Amino acid sequence: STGSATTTPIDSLDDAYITPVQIGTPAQTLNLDFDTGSSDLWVFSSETTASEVDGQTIYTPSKSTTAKLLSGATWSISYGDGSSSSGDVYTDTVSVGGLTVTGQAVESAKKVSSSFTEDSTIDGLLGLAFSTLNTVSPTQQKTFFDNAKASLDSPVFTADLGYHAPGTYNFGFIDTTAYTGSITYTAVSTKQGFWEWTSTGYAVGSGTFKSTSIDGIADTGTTLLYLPATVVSAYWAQVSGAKSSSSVGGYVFPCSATLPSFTFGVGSARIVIPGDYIDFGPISTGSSSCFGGIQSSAGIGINIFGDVALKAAFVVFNGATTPTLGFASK
Ligand SMILES: NCc1ccc(C(F)(F)F)cc1
Ligand SMILES: NCc1ccc(C(F)(F)F)cc1
Numbered sequence: 001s002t003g004s005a006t007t008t009p010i011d012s013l014d015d016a017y018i019t020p021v022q023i024g025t026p027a028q029t030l031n032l033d034f035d036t037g038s039s040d041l042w043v044f045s046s047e048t049t050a051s052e053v054d055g056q057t058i059y060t061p062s063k064s065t066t067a068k069l070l071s072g073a074t075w076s077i078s079y080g081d082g083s084s085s086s087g088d089v090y091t092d093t094v095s096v097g098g099l100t101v102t103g104q105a106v107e108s109a110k111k112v113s114s115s116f117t118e119d120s121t122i123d124g125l126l127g128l129a130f131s132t133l134n135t136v137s138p139t140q141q142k143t144f145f146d147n148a149k150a151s152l153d154s155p156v157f158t159a160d161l162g163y164h165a166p167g168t169y170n171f172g173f174i175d176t177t178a179y180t181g182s183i184t185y186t187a188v189s190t191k192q193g194f195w196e197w198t199s200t201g202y203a204v205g206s207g208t209f210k211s212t213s214i215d216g217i218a219d220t221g222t223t224l225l226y227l228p229a230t231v232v233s234a235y236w237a238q239v240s241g242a243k244s245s246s247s248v249g250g251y252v253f254p255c256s257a258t259l260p261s262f263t264f265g266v267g268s269a270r271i272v273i274p275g276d277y278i279d280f281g282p283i284s285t286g287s288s289s290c291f292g293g294i295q296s297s298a299g300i301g302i303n304i305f306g307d308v309a310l311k312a313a314f315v316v317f318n319g320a321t322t323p324t325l326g327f328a329s330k
Contacts, residue, residue, distance in 0.1 A: 043059040047088070083116060200268075
């Protein structure tokens with residue numbers, strides 16, 4: 001079997017993407033943030049503290065005839081930006097774009113951090129990293145992808161994120177009309193639970209390509225591109241007036257400047273990120289300082305190929321027994 005769902009940016013800056021997901025019987029449709037950097041499927045629910053809910057659609061397990069409480073199970077997660085949530089665990093039927101999994105662990109939030117409450121458009125997260133990162137205790141739970149793997153035509157899913165436009169998540173097949181050229185596959189390390197791979201180098205604008213190994217993770221749940229300080233400094237040095245601002249927390253640049261493109265290597269292939277993808281707009285309403293989409297990973301401890309990079313490509317997450325990542329131009 002296969003599944004296909006449209007994913008839509010939540011705002012004009014592509015800060016995140018939401019995808020409709022059907023949970024329960026009869027279906028309750030929630031818009032979830034598909035996150036290849038985590039492994040929990042958690043939702044706002046009827047059990048969430050009422051003051052912590054501001055416009056989200058909530059999952060109500062008591063209205064689903066297939067929902068079962070997973071006796072004694074709890075979950076608690078903290079994200080790399082300081083966000084967190086926690087609660088209990090149901091199992092229920094979950095469908096994405098026609099692809100149905102029965103008995104999927106649905107983690108019901110009793111408490112969410114402020115950053116989720118303020119994001120009225122995101123009803124929860126659907127984790128697509130490896131199941132070793134799932135936070136359910138005492139019995140660890142499998143991701144939607146892991147549960148679907150057996151019945152998929154091919155154990156893959158693909159991410160085709162749009163620039164200021166809708167995109168597609170496909171499960172179980174590779175749409176050969178959605179990219180140009182060939183797909184370049186590269187090895188994945190699962191040792192930390194992430195879709196971790198090694199980029200073969202980078203170039204700034206029309207400069208020389210610098211061959212150098214950048215280890216990092218493919219993360220649809222992170223907005224920006226976080227790279228080593230040496231790389232990020234070489235990029236922003238080509239932008240007149242750009243500087244690192246401690247009060248803002250990263251590189252900013254004059255909104256009137258034109259940004260150079262950024263190229264990253266995948267084996268012998270090259271993925272080019274247009275300079276416009278790196279503009280994240282004014283730091284405050286009316287400001288003439290704009291926030292950059294390429295930032296240093298020094299404070300984070302790991303390099304992150306977030307949406308800024310992934311939306312420049314067609315990306316194959318190949319969950320075969322030896323996992324690989326595929327990149328194609330589009
Ligand atoms: N998108 C989920 C996620 C969030 C944070 C991290 C970090 F910061 F720990 F690397 C990885 C993955
Ligand atoms: N990387 C996971 C993640 C995804 C979304 C959010 C936000 F934006 F909703 F707070 C935080 C963390």
